[PDB]
């Protein structure tokens, strides 16, 4: 029992076979990321616009991730789930998020900010819907390291390699909030606290931190 949906932009559409008891909930999204969905354009080479299914049903998914609410909440689970699982079968196969986005990037005509906006998208969307990455990977490397056919060595760099880091920073916080928001909320904590208890540490930060 499903009633074909249309999430389409120009020349360019993917149908969400969703089950016929929600199709009313799915259509109510549907409008409403179609609102949100900018007018099409040659190439859809402009901000913020899919070039491919899979960017476009990740925009969805990050949509119907924003109107859910972690926690209690009843409105819109079922929608994200099934998209969710949609999105899973007929774009990740079994791999990982990153693989489909070198795969977009590469194959296809998808820019880096886009592709990092469907990476962003499929993680929010994962952690809304209560479905952590709690499951151990199937990663090609850790199962050579697991087998002894690899040994890996982590280096970390320092200073001098890049002249903006901070980009990076923001790159982190805009593309993984939900994996690092914590992180960087602790650091930062902790950092203000340093320099709150440090005699003149207030001095060499001029303009705070």
Do not use: W
């Amino acid at each position: 029992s499903t009633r074909p949906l249309t999430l389409s932009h120009g020349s360019l559409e993917h149908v969400l076979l969703v089950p016929t008891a929600s199709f009313f909930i799915a259509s109510q999204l549907q409008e409403q990321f179609n609102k949100i969905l900018p007018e099409p354009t040659e190439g859809f080479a402009a901000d913020d616009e899919p070039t491919t299914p899979a960017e476009l049903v990740g925009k969805f998914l990050g949509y119907v991730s924003s109107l859910v609410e972690p926690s209690k909440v009843g409105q819109f689970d079922q929608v994200l789930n099934l998209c969710l699982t949609e999105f899973e079968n007929c774009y990740l196969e079994g791999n990982d998020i990153h693989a489909l986005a070198a795969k977009l990037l590469q194959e296809n005509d998808t820019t880096l900010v886009k592709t990092k906006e469907l990476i962003k998208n499929y993680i929010t969307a994962r952690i809304m819907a209560k479905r952590p990455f709690d499951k151990k990977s199937n990663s090609a490397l850790f199962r050579a390291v697991g087998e002894g056919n690899a040994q890996l060595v982590a280096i970390f760099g320092g200073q001098g390699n890049t002249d903006d880091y901070f980009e990076e920073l923001r790159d982190l916080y805009q593309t993984y909030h939900v994996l690092v928001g914590d992180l960087i909320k602790f650091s930062a904590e902790t950092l203000s606290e340093l320099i709150r208890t440090t005699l003149d540490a207030e001095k060499v930060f001029t303009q705070g931190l």
